[PDB]
């Protein structure tokens, strides 16, 4: 999901949290 990712990236969180949410 290109859009689900671009959302996670836009969020204000630590890189670990983005990585956590994008892998999961």
């Amino acid at each position: 999901n290109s859009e689900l990712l671009s959302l996670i990236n836009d969020m204000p969180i630590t890189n670990d949290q983005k990585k956590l949410m994008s892998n999961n």
Epitope: N1, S2, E3, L5, S6, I8, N9, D10, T14, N15, D16, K18, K19, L20, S22, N23
Partner: antibody
Framework: QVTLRESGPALVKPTQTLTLTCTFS??????????VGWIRQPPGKALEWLAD???????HYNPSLKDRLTISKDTSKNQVVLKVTNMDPADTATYYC????????????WGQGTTVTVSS | DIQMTQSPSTLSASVGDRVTITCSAS?????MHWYQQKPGKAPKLLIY???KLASGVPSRFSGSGSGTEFTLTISSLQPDDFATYYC?????????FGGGTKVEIKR
């Protein structure tokens, strides 16, 4: 296989601007999650991260080399460009580009690097 | 920002020896990553996600750690392992590498 090739001047006078280009293949930067970062290695020193950029045009820079850095992309030509202003002999180093993903914030594939010397 | 202290800075060991390299970060980190570099070559990814083996990397290598303390371990050291090893964090900006560890092989 994903490949990356850096290119730019080998020699550059002090105060002059360095313009590096990373041409890659095997993947597209317009793909979600994809990123390209620049990393350099001064003679007899450890690796130093410089900058990166993402498919959504988000950019990051290393505060040490600020505000001398400018990073941009062109997905059409599959390339990323890094500019370093006001070059100093201490900026002499080997410069690398490398792929990155948000699934994994590390550089899995690297270019072979190109060497830049700052001298009169 | 997050700095990385790596030890030992240098090392010499015989083929077959167990070798352990340590990286200690100034602040807490989610994952530690490791890079092997040969002379005049570009760094190759050895270990990612703290303990995961990158592709084409002998199970001889292994990773372990959490918080601010991580270690890389080469079970039975071999000739082709001569290199400089760097840890890498991407958990926060700027990205940073460790000072590096230089591995020489006693023969």
């Amino acid at each position: 296989q994903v490949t990356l090739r850096e290119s730019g001047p080998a020699l550059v006078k002090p105060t002059q601007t360095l313009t590096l280009t990373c041409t890659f293949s095997g993947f597209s930067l317009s793909t979600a999650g994809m990123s390209v970062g620049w990393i350099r290695q001064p003679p007899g020193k450890a690796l130093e991260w410089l900058a990166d950029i993402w498919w959504d045009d988000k950019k990051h820079y290393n505060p040490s080399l600020k505000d001398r850095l400018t990073i941009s992309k062109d997905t059409s030509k599959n390339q990323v460009v890094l500019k370093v202003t006001n070059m100093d002999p201490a900026d002499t180093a080997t410069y690398y580009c490398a792929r990155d993903m948000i699934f994994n914030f590390y550089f899995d594939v690297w270019g072979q690097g190109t060497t830049v010397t700052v001298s009169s | 920002d997050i700095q990385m202290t790596q030890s030992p800075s240098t090392l010499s060991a015989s083929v077959g020896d167990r070798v352990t390299i340590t990286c200690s970060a100034s602040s807490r980190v989610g994952y530690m990553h490791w890079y092997q570099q040969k002379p005049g070559k570009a760094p190759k990814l050895l270990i990612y996600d703290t303990s995961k083996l990158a592709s084409g990397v002998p199970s001889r290598f292994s990773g372990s750690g959490s918080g601010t303390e991580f270690t890389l371990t080469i079970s039975s050291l071999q000739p082709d392992d001569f290199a400089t090893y760097y840890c890498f964090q991407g958990s926060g900006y700027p990205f940073t590498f460790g000072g590096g560890t230089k591995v020489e092989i006693k023969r």
